[PDB]
Every structure is written in C-alpha cells, then in structure tokens.
C-alpha cells in the first residue's frame, strides 16, 4: 500500500496545501525561502534519476530525508507570541517522510519529486510568499 | 523619592459580600496608599462599566480577577515611573490607555481604585491630609449629611413608591452635633417601630424597611422620631426623599405607575400629576430635598419640575446625570434640576470626578458625593466632600460600617481643622433662594 | 546585572525629565503602537506586557550606570567586581611576522 | 525616634450607632498607630468594664467623652516619653494607673484603644506588618473562619432558643477559598430565604434571622444553602452554634427552660436532659462547634458535657470564661470546655489578651478571638488571630463592612505571607481526636 | 538596606576541639548576624544530618569544610537577594534547595547556621533584641533550668546506668535566684565530693562524673547537697533524671539490661518492671522529670508509662521523638509522653523548631529548649526559649561557658524585661496536674 499513486499525487497536494496553517489575516505562514533547499535538492534528484541507476542515488535520497527532517526542525515563525514550524506542519500534512519510505526505484523516486512539484505549485496557487 | 515604584491590586469583599478590588501604591521613597473601589454597575450605556469575571463557577460570576489583572499588567506598566503627586497625568495616561468612553476595556473600577491609591499615596508622601492634597488649603466646610432612614420601592416589601427617606439635620451649629441628632433620631426611630411591632433588621446602606401604609406614613412616623429625640422638623431637621420614579416610570404610556410598589389599586400619575403631588409633598411636609423625581429619559418633565419647585425644594439628577459631563452641561443648558448626585465610580476617575463637582458649582448646582450600595472601609468621599467644599454629603444610615466610616473621617476632618471648621447647614443649599 | 547598580544622576536625571512620562508602546514585532491598541493587545495575550515598551530618552550623555558594593568579611566596603575581575593574563599575544609589506604614511 | 510624643483620643461611632472612641499615637519620628475599641459592656462582675458618660441627653447615656478625657489628660501625661516598642511596659504602666482590678477608674475602652494605638504606632514605626511585630517571625496560619448566618434568641422573633448558627468552611485548600465557599452559601441561603417569603434584612452580626419554625428548621436551611452552593456538608463546610444558654437558664430551678423564646410547647431540660439534647443535635447534623451549649455557672454542667461530648466537639466557653485568666485556670482544672472565645476589650489590653491566649494554647485549648456586637473599621483582631497562629476566628457574616472589613485584612494578610502561608481547617481543631 | 548582600562561612571549634562551622551575613545596610552551629550527629534514620569532610588525615574525619564550601558557593547565591527579614521564606528557598528530607546534601549543619545568621542579621536591623524578633512583644517567661549536676551511663565509669541527674531550682522566686541556688548546689555538692574523695573534674556537660555506688547513692548525695546549700528538696530544688534508655536496651529480648552500665548482678528489667522501678524512685526521690525512660522505639512502653507517671512526673522524650514533627504527631495521637526536648540542630531550621514548639505546645506538652554535647559559645537556644515562652531549659551544669553564655543570656534577658521578666517556676510544669 502506498500513499503516492500517478492518479492521486496531485489531489494530494491539493489537500495538503490546503490545510497548511495561516495567520489570522489569512496569509500562509510557509514561504518557499523556507523550503528552497528542499526544493532544489528535489530538482536535483529528479534530474539525476533519468541518467544513473538507482543504486547509484542511495546516497541522495538519505541526505535528502535528513535535510527534511532538519528543515522540519529548524524553520520557525512567530507572530502575536506564537511560534509555528511551517515547514514541519507542511511534511506531516503532506506526508512527505512516509512517502520518502517509499521510494525504492526510479519509478518511486520521480512519482515522489512531482508530488513536490505539485505540492509548490499548489502553494504559489493559494497566495503563498517567497 | 515621589516616584511610583509599584501598582499591584488584589481583590477583596466589599460590604455584601461581592468581589471588589483594592489598589496598593508605593513610590521610591516608601510612601503608600491604597484605594478601595464601590461595587457599582458593569452594564451600562452612558456610565462607566466595571469589568466583572463572568465566571459562574466563582462568585456567581461577579469575580473581579480579570480587572485586577487589568491593573498588575497593564496599567502598572504604564504608571510606574510617573511622579506619585502628578494625578492629572495618571488618570489621563489611565484614560487613554483604556481608549473607550465607558471604560470597558481595563474596568472602570481598576482605573478607579489605581487613581484613588495614587492620590492617597502622593498624600501620605507629601505629609498632608487627603481633603488638604485634592482641595488645596482652603478646604473648611464640613458637608451636611443626608441620612437615610427610611426604605422603600424595590428595597421594601412596604407599599411605597418612593425608594429612600432621608433626615437631613441642617439645623445643627457643628458636623458633630448634626451627626448626634442623625444617631439620636435613628434611636428613637428604632424605638417607634419596635413598639409598632415593624421590621427592625437594616437593609444595604443601614436604613429600616418597615410595612408602612404608605408614602404619607412614613414621612409622619420620620418627623414623629425626631419629635420624639427633641428635635422641631422644618427648623432643626428636614426631610428628603429618593423616589428613583425611574424604576415606577411607564415609558411607553409615558406616565408613572405608582401601581408597580403600592398594589392594583395605586393612582397612576401622568407628568404634571406627578409634579402636583411632589407639591402637595412639599407644601404638607418639611420636604428640603427630592432626587430622581423625574425619568432620567423625562425632559421636559424635569424642566417642569425645576420651574414648579426649584426655587424652594433642592433637585437632585442621579440617574438624571449619572455623573456625565455632557448631561449635566445639557441640564445646565435646559434648566433642569439644581444638583447633581456625584458617585466616583460612574465615571471612573477622581479628575473627572472634580471636573463634574466644577462644572455643577459654576452653574449654581449643589453638588452631593454619594455612597454606592456596595462600599467598602474606604473613606475617600469624605475627604472629596470636604476637598470640593461641596457642603452637602450622602453616605447612608447610622447603622453599618460601610456608612460609619465616612462619618468618622468627617469627624476626625472636623477635629483636626479645629476652629476653622465650618459647618453651614442650610447656607450649603445655595442652589435655593432664602 | 548584579556588580553594577544604576547611578544616583541618572536617576535624578530620568525622574525631573520627566522621561517615564512619555512611553512609547510596542507590538511583539517591535513596532510603535498607541497605548490603546498595546492594552487591547496585553489583555489579549498577543504582546508581552514586560519588555514592549520604552522609558523616551535622558539626555547629556550622563552615565547612567554605578558599581555596586558588597561588605568584606572584616566588615569593609569593596567594589563586588574589583577583586573577582581576573586570575590570569590571559596568555597572547602573537607576533606575526610581516616585515614584508608596504605601508601607508 | 521612636519615642512616644503624642496621645490623642476622640470620640467616634460603632457599628450600631452607639459612641466608641479612638485613640492616635505619634512617635518622634513620625510614626503613627491608630486604634479604635469595639463596643462592650459596662457591667460585669469580672470582666471590664468601658468608661461611659451616662448624660441622658447625649447620646442616651452612651457618650464616650469621659474615657476621651481620660486619655488625653491622664494617660497621655503618663505614656508620652515611653519608647513605642514598649508594649507590656505601657500595658503594665496603664493597669497601674487605673489601680482598680475591672480597670473601671480609666475604662477598659480608653486602655484598650491606647494598647492597639501603641502596638500599630510600633509596628509602623519597624515598617513590619502588625502581626510580623505582635507574634514574631513564625506568623503563618490563617484562621479558619465561624462565619455566622442565621440568628435567634434575643436577636431574632422566631421560636429558636439558640442565639446564632454558623458555617465553618474548614474543608477549603486556602482561606481565599473558604471565604468564597461562605460569600457563596450566603448568597444561596438569601436566595432560598427570598423563595420561601422569609425575611432577607441583616442583623448586628450580618446574618438573617428569618421566621423559622425551630432550630431544627434552620440547622436544615443551613444544609440545603450549603448543598445548592455545591459543597458537601461534613466534608466541606461544617455547622457550628452559639446556644447563649446563660439567656433561658431558669438560675433558681436549675433548668434550661427553653420557653422563654420557643414559646409555651417548648421543653424545660435539666443539665444532664440539655447535654442529651445538644449530644442528639450533634448526631443528627454535622455539628463541630457549641458555643455556651451550658450556663456560665452550671460548672457540673460544663464538666459532664466536656465529658460526653468534648472528644469530637469543641465546645467555646463565651460567657463562661468573659476571657479571664482566673476563670479559664479554674476551667482547666476542672477540663470544663475546651475552647475559650477571646475577646480583646473583655480583658483590656493586647498584654493580657495574649496571656490568655497562650494560657489556653498551652492547657491544649483553643483560642478564638471573637467580634463585638458593636465593631469597627479596625481590624486588628485579624492580626491578632495570625499573629498567635491561634487558626479560628469568629468575626460575622458576609454582609457588612464591620465584619468583612476583617475579612479583607486576613486576604491582605495572606497575599503578603504568600508560599509561607497555611491554611489548615480541621487540623486547626487540635482540641480535638482525629 | 535588609537585602542581604554577603554571607561567609567559616570553619571554627566547638566546646570539644571537634570542628564546626559558623556563618556571617551581612545586609545592604551593614546589618551584621553570625549563627554558630553545636555538633551533631552525620547519622540517623529520621534525623537532619551534618555534613563532614570525612577525610580522616584532617580532624579524623571531623572536618568541616565541605559545609562550608557549601554555604559559600551553594547556599550564598540563593540567598544573597532576599530580605533579611525573609526567615520563613529564606528557610523555605534552602529546604529546597537542598532537597532531601534530612537535609544531606547542603548539610543541616550549614542551612542551621545561616538561618541563625538571618535571624540575628534581621533582628540587628530592626534593633530589637533577638528574643523580640522571634516570638514577639509577649515575651517575658524566663525558662526553668534542669541543670546537670552528676554523670552516669555512657559519660561515666560508675555503675550507673542512668546518663544525666540534674537538678531544677523551681521554687525561686526569680531566674537570677535560681542560678545563684544551682550555682551553690554546685560548689556544695563539689566540697562533698572532695570530702568522699571522689573525683572533682567535669566532663562535656559540664557536670561530675564520680565514682559512685549506683542510682540511688547519687540521688542521695544529690539531695544532701541541696540540703547543705540551704535549700528544701522536694519544695525549692526538685530532681530530674535522664536515663537514656535507649543505651542499655536490648532489643532482641525486648528487656532493659542494667548489667551493660551498673555490673553483673544488675537487675534486669521488662517494660512493665522498668515502669515499677521509676514510679518507685519517683516516690522515694523529688524526682518531677524523667527523660528518655523508655526506648526510642518502645511505644507500648511509652504509652503506659506516661499512663502511670504522666500525671505527676514530665516524662521527656528526646530520642523517642528526635524533635521530628512526625513523630511528635504520633506521640500526640498515641499519648505517649508529655514533653519533647527540642534541638535545634536535629531539625537544621529555626522555622522548623518553632513549628515544632507551637505543635507541642498546642497538644499540652511542653518544649524543653536543649544543647548538645558540643556547645560553641553562641546561646541563641535561650533567646529561643524567652521567645517561645516555653518555660524551660536544659542547657548544662555550672562550669563551662558553653553553658554559662546561655545562662549570661537569660540574666541579660531578665534584666532587660526588667519589671515584665516572669519566673513561672513549678508553674512552667504545665504538662501536670494540679
């Protein structure tokens, strides 16, 4: 059973996005400079993947969870005396670490990169800020 | 050495037994006050509110701990570091930290008891009497009491419309001797209506419910009482009345209903049948002063009443006014009433309150600092009385502590000015001709 | 902040300047706000009433800082700092060697 | 510096109408005490006696100006020049000068009001809160309140033979608590009164005295107040009685003959007949106070009810004991009671008072330093109840400032003791097992 | 000004060359206080233990430095801030601190001295003398001494098993009298011992330790030396005994051996057999206080011996309640003795010990105010026991000033209440009857 389907990914973003936390004046608390990293890792791994075997990209994926879970981590942003962690409420709703569980091929691993790919473009679509 | 170091409240009982708060103030140099605020009204339309809990777990919801965090929070940020004598500046820094007109936000009564702290606290730091810091050095009249002794309307089971009864002992050459003959006349009073076989007990401010027949019996068993203690009624004793006829007032059939407290079968008076029987009132009874005779929502009524009777009998706006600026310069403006009842806590604030007690001598008006139905041991409107030489007091009866104690600052204010001391009787009723 | 005290001057200074008279309010993002809305704001919860406001400015570059002094164990004043302040030279320095360089006059 | 420059003494009013006096002292360094005297009684046989004028034509005989005189031109000679830390050295000096054993030569109500003057000149003088200087650094527990709510006897018309009934919130975690648990009682007591078309005005003490049909019908009004506040009766708050047997004791037949206020079905008891009514009463209703359950010269009676009920009771002799250390020695000896009731102005002075309370903390008695009918503003009686850690207190309802003011002074007391302060309730009745 | 600013501690000798420590604080102001701490014991179960460097090169092991490493670098940064007049809550901050219930990682020998220092930096501060700061301005009973004046036990080579013999001078009009008498009782029972050829020189107390006959040949010599100083036994000067029973109790077979202490034909005795022996030598002896005459854990015993002697004889418990609230309550609630002797340094908080004196007091026990067996020459213990006005003291014989700077105090204590001072004498034997 896996989360990530090629005829669900998108909707999936979709959702996850849209339950992300927002101020009280309605804007997102996640902007991309926040994820910048994580994105550009992704487009790196998902260029990668067309040419070398999977074997070969061992490594990138690890350094890549890890970088999630340390961005998860790290990124916070207080407003009226409360403090939130966007990054780490956008990789539990989005389900990002299990779906990283869940890569063991080329297949898996570029499903994985467009849920990314959509997962961003749906929050440029609802007013999220670089 | 004069500067606020610390603002911290806490909250207490006030006199039945509901939440209040009390304020401490200490400056640098060790100077301390502390102010205690009167249980007032936390809904309001014109008049500042008091921020209550609403918690119905604690004290059916009348805790005040939201505005004693008001004042340890808030207001004590701002106001440590001022001057403890620069009490215009306090209560104006108070003011527009609150930022509402009734005062909602912070609470009417922490900014209150935070201005009533401040002053006792530069007093105590300048060495002075409290009557001598707010009124400056001429402060010498003693104000003559309005004791209440008699209750009825929606404080009686009695069928009387009018709510409160009162002796005024204006007849005496000193404030000592008139709160004598008040005691005095309470006594015998006591003693009437115990072999009358009426109620005794005493109700929120000290003064007796009895089961009168009416509003006529009891004006006849008040005067028989200070007969009794020895005293000539219209020379030495006057009578007062409260009616509150805001409480018996049809709005909608715009007459008062005298049928709400004496029955079904209770005349029901229109305007100017109200105005006639206040004269009738009058002209039968030693009668020096009425308040509330009118709606507070009755004009013209009041305007009538003030052409009818203001030259002879004093008219006090309690709930006319509500100690508003704004009303009293518009009844100033109309001719409506003569006096205005001063209650600190309806407006919140002791420079308001000696801007309203200004604006009302100006005119002509008496001012009457007034007691709320809740009070606490603070005396502060003792020696605001004396301060304003406002001249006329209304504190309650001569029964609980909550009243006692104004009576003992006015006493202890009589002593230590000595000779200088005046106590003017009917000469503080200025707003009457004669 | 225990060795130093705040200094009799200053405080005379701040107190007939009349500095804490003028307040200046601030939201929990360190922006000026009017004293209603830094009220509405501390009552709900969203500024921290403590360190969100400011005593206006003393001037005269006076100093507005003093030591502070304790009781020796023979009953004698001392500075609390003045004893306590070191133990070692620290080592250092290094003499780097640069002979070759233009300097300029 | 802290010697004793001035004594004033001036006449003011109680809580009743009724004269008292007060007495300021000023030291050279500006400190200042201020202290007024409950109203007592003149005649006694061993107890003190107050000094009064018995000038028919003021006050009714109650004037004070006589002990006023006394202070100012007797004792004020005698004490000026003392160091105001001397407490016991002007207590001594003053009983000295009255010379008489009931301190009937000066009037215990002028000592007394110079003894409280004297230990709050000393306290402001040590900048230390009154009890820090009247019991020592170990000051910590609040006491646990018998906060009366219903009447009878002299003080009512119904057919009940005990004087008053009391709620004891000994249950509460704090004292802030407790007196919540009893302002709310209070109120629901009120509200339960108003629907059964009793009587809601106040007594002397604060409380209702409402037309009940017996004791039993109070006791039972009490329970059903206590559970609609929500608290649970034996678990939370506890009912104590003050019986004033001495009022229906029948002295030459040697019964309790209850007729005198109960009507003519009413029981005449014996001794050992009223010891069995008050031991049923207790089984019956979660009793853990009587207060005067005997007469105050029924010592047999006092010894067997000790006897029988003395283990699980505490039984407060009032009248028994009139707080005298030769009374309560002679009590001791015989294990009559095992509570005095402490009044301040009985005895005279804060030097005796203590005496006594320490007499009875050491004879594993209880103290409870009680109100007078006529009270104050003063409220050092709260002080003095923490300063000894005596842990009960009786000082009225929840409903006026002469009581609450008491009220508002152990709050106080308790804000400032802060972590350090205890409340124990039940473990405060160390006069009893388990 | 009260803020203390410096504490220092120090490590000094006791009255055995054994170390201890003492502290100093220092207030803002430059209030001085210096607390010397007696020597205790590093073990027991249910006991404050000290602290000890435990580095046997160094004093044997006896030092004290850890101590005082902790009250400088632990105990000072905690409580330099606070306000001297702090005690309750200063005690409060260092108990947890600490944070074990005997006190052993600060040690309770440190936190006893800097509570000493606070209280005696706060009452030179406020310029009072210590026993005003402590217990208040009703301080004014001087304390009973039961002075030692023969040895036996484990402090002798004699075949007595009992440790301590003292006598009480209760008869004596003043505490100066009683000093002078036990002083002669002294230098008489000396001449007697010369005259038998015993030995003269004094052990830690302070008092003989001769080579007798047993229990009653001491008794006897005791007595004669009372009747040659002049003076009536059983009327002026009374007995006292502490057995320490605890030393020659077996366990195992539930009995008390005297053959351990008094030889090989000593008798050996059961609970009930150890009771018949006391209550005969109370009977054949003026013997009025009885210490420690049961094992520390023998509660049956206990409990049937204050049965039977407790009417008439103190029976103290020092190591049956090791002055540990706990304990105390369940000797309360379990009738086992009537007195507790209170040590100071057993408990390591003054708070602590006058919680423990007001607990027993409250219950009819009397807290006797002990030393220890290494004494310094601070006598902080009988400013505590004037404070508390417990009425008695143990604080040694008449030839060291480990004890004479406690009985120095007391006489400057009595000479500074001047006309207040009170010797209660017999009376201060509260715990009895009659």
């Given at each position: 059973?896996?989360?990530?389907?090629?005829?669900?990914?998108?909707?999936?973003?979709?959702?996850?996005?849209?339950?992300?936390?927002?101020?009280?004046?309605?804007?997102?608390?996640?902007?991309?400079?926040?994820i910048?990293?994580?994105?550009?890792?992704?487009?790196?791994?998902?260029?990668?993947?067309?040419?070398?075997?999977?074997?070969?990209?061992?490594?990138?994926?690890?350094?890549?969870?890890?970088?999630?879970?340390?961005?998860?981590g790290?990124?916070?942003?207080?407003?009226?005396?409360?403090?939130?962690?966007?990054?780490?409420?956008?990789?539990?709703?989005?389900?990002?670490?299990?779906?990283?569980?869940?890569?063991?091929?080329?297949?898996?691993?570029?499903?994985?990169?467009?849920?990314?790919?959509?997962?961003?473009?749906?929050?440029?679509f609802?007013?999220?800020?670089? | 050495?004069?500067?606020?170091?610390?603002?911290?409240?806490?909250?207490?009982?006030?006199?039945?037994?509901?939440?209040?708060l009390?304020?401490?103030?200490?400056?640098?140099?060790?100077?301390?006050?502390?102010?205690?605020?009167?249980?007032?009204?936390?809904?309001?339309?014109?008049?500042?509110?008091?921020?209550?809990?609403?918690?119905?777990?604690?004290?059916?919801?009348?805790?005040?701990?939201?505005?004693?965090?008001?004042?340890?929070?808030?207001?004590?940020?701002?106001?440590?570091?001022?001057?403890?004598?620069?009490?215009?500046?306090?209560?104006?820094?108070?003011?527009?930290?609150?930022?509402?007109?009734?005062?909602?936000?912070?609470?009417?009564?922490?900014?209150?008891?935070?201005?009533?702290?401040?002053?006792?606290?530069?007093?105590?730091?300048?060495?002075?009497?409290?009557?001598?810091?707010?009124?400056?050095?001429?402060?010498?009249?003693?104000?003559?009491?309005?004791?209440?002794?008699?209750?009825?309307?929606?404080?009686?089971?009695?069928?009387?419309?009018?709510?409160?009864?009162?002796?005024?002992?204006?007849?005496?050459?000193?404030?000592?001797?008139?709160?004598?003959?008040?005691?005095e006349?309470?006594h015998?009073?006591?003693?009437?209506?115990?072999?009358?076989?009426?109620?005794?007990?005493?109700?929120?401010?000290?003064?007796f419910?009895?089961?009168?027949?009416?509003?006529?019996?009891?004006?006849?068993?008040?005067?028989?009482?200070?007969?009794?203690?020895?005293?000539?009624?219209g020379?030495?004793?006057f009578?007062?009345?409260?009616?509150?006829?805001?409480?018996?007032?049809?709005?909608?059939?715009?007459?008062?209903?005298?049928?709400?407290?004496?029955?079904?079968?209770?005349?029901?008076?229109?305007?100017?049948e109200?105005?006639?029987?206040?004269?009738?009132?009058?002209?039968?009874?030693?009668?020096?002063?009425?308040?509330?005779?009118?709606?507070?929502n009755?004009?013209?009524?009041?305007?009538?009443?003030?052409?009818?009777?203001?030259?002879?009998?004093?008219?006090?706006?309690?709930?006319?006014?509500?100690?508003?600026?704004?009303?009293?310069?518009?009844?100033?403006?109309?001719?409506?009433?003569?006096?205005?009842?001063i209650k600190?806590?309806?407006?919140?604030?002791?420079?308001?309150?000696?801007?309203?007690?200004?604006?009302?001598?100006?005119?002509?008006?008496?001012?009457?600092?007034?007691?709320?139905?809740?009070?606490?041991?603070?005396?502060?409107?003792?020696?605001?009385?004396?301060?304003?030489?406002?001249?006329?007091?209304?504190?309650?009866?001569?029964?609980?502590?909550?009243?006692?104690?104004?009576?003992?600052?006015?006493?202890?204010?009589?002593?230590?000015?000595?000779?200088?001391?005046?106590?003017?009787?009917?000469?503080?009723?200025?707003?009457?001709?004669? | 902040?225990?060795?130093?005290?705040?200094?009799?001057?200053?405080?005379?200074?701040?107190?007939?300047?009349?500095?804490?008279?003028?307040?200046?309010?601030?939201?929990?993002?360190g922006?000026?706000?009017?004293?209603?809305?830094?009220?509405?704001?501390?009552?709900?919860?969203?500024?921290?009433?403590?360190?969100?406001?400011?005593?206006?400015?003393?001037?005269?570059?006076?100093?507005?800082?003093?030591?502070?002094?304790?009781?020796?164990?023979?009953?004698?004043?001392?500075?609390?700092?003045?004893?306590?302040?070191?133990?070692?030279?620290?080592?250092?320095?290094?003499?780097?060697?640069?002979?070759?360089?233009?300097?300029?006059?």
């Open positions: 059973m896996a989360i990530l389907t090629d005829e669900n990914y998108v909707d999936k973003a979709e959702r996850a996005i849209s339950l992300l936390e927002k101020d009280n004046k309605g804007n997102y608390l996640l902007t991309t400079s926040q910048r990293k994580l994105l550009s890792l992704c487009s790196s791994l998902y260029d990668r993947s067309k040419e070398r075997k999977f074997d070969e990209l061992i490594n990138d994926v690890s350094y890549l969870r890890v970088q999630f879970v340390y961005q998860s790290r990124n916070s942003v207080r407003v009226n005396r409360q403090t939130f962690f966007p990054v780490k409420d956008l990789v539990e709703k989005g389900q990002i670490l299990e779906a990283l569980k869940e890569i063991k091929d080329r297949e898996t691993l570029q499903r994985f990169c467009r849920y990314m790919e959509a997962l961003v473009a749906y929050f440029k609802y007013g999220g800020k670089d | 050495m004069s500067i606020i170091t610390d603002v911290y409240a806490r909250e207490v009982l006030d006199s039945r037994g509901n939440p209040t009390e304020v401490e103030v200490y400056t640098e140099s060790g100077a301390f006050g502390r102010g205690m605020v009167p249980s007032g009204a936390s809904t309001g339309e014109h008049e500042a509110v008091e921020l209550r809990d609403g918690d119905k777990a604690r004290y059916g919801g009348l805790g005040t701990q939201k505005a004693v965090d008001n004042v340890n929070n808030v207001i004590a940020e701002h106001i440590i570091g001022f001057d403890v004598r620069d009490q215009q500046g306090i209560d104006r820094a108070m003011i527009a930290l609150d930022g509402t007109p009734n005062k909602g936000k912070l609470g009417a009564n922490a900014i209150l008891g935070v201005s009533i702290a401040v002053a006792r606290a530069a007093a105590d730091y300048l060495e002075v009497p409290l009557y001598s810091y707010l009124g400056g050095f001429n402060t010498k009249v003693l104000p003559t009491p309005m004791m209440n002794i008699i209750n009825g309307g929606s404080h009686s089971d009695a069928p009387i419309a009018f709510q409160e009864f009162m002796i005024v002992p204006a007849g005496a050459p000193t404030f000592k001797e008139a709160l004598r003959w008040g005691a006349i309470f015998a009073l006591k003693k009437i209506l115990k072999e009358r076989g009426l109620e005794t007990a005493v109700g929120d401010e000290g003064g419910a009895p089961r009168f027949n009416g509003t006529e019996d009891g004006v006849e068993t008040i005067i028989k009482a200070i007969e009794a203690a020895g005293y000539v009624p020379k030495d004793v009578i007062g009345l409260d009616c509150a006829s805001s409480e018996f007032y049809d709005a909608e059939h715009k007459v008062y209903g005298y049928t709400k407290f004496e029955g079904e079968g209770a005349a029901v008076r229109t305007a100017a109200q105005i006639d029987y206040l004269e009738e009132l009058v002209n039968k009874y030693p009668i020096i002063t009425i308040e509330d005779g009118m709606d507070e009755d004009w013209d009524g009041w305007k009538a009443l003030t052409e009818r009777l203001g030259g002879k009998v004093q008219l006090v706006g309690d709930d006319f006014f509500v100690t508003n600026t704004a009303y009293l310069e518009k009844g100033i403006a109309e001719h409506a009433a003569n006096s205005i009842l600190v806590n309806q407006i919140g604030t002791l420079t308001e309150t000696f801007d309203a007690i200004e604006m009302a001598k100006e005119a002509g008006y008496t001012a009457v600092v007034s007691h709320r139905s809740g009070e606490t041991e603070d005396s502060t409107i003792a020696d605001i009385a004396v301060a304003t030489n406002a001249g006329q007091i209304k504190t309650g009866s001569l029964s609980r502590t909550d009243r006692i104690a104004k009576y003992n600052q006015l006493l202890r204010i009589e002593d230590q000015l000595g000779e200088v001391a005046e106590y003017r009787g009917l000469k503080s009723f200025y707003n009457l001709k004669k | 902040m225990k060795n130093f005290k705040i200094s009799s001057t200053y405080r005379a200074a701040r107190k007939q300047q009349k500095t804490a008279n003028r307040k200046s309010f601030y939201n929990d993002e922006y000026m706000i009017s004293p209603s809305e830094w009220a509405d704001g501390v009552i709900k919860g969203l500024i921290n009433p403590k360190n969100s406001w400011s005593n206006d400015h003393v001037k005269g570059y006076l100093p507005r800082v003093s030591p502070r002094s304790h009781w020796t164990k023979n009953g004698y004043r001392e500075y609390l700092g003045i004893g306590k302040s070191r133990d070692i030279p620290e080592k250092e320095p290094e003499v780097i060697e640069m002979m070759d360089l233009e300097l300029v006059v």
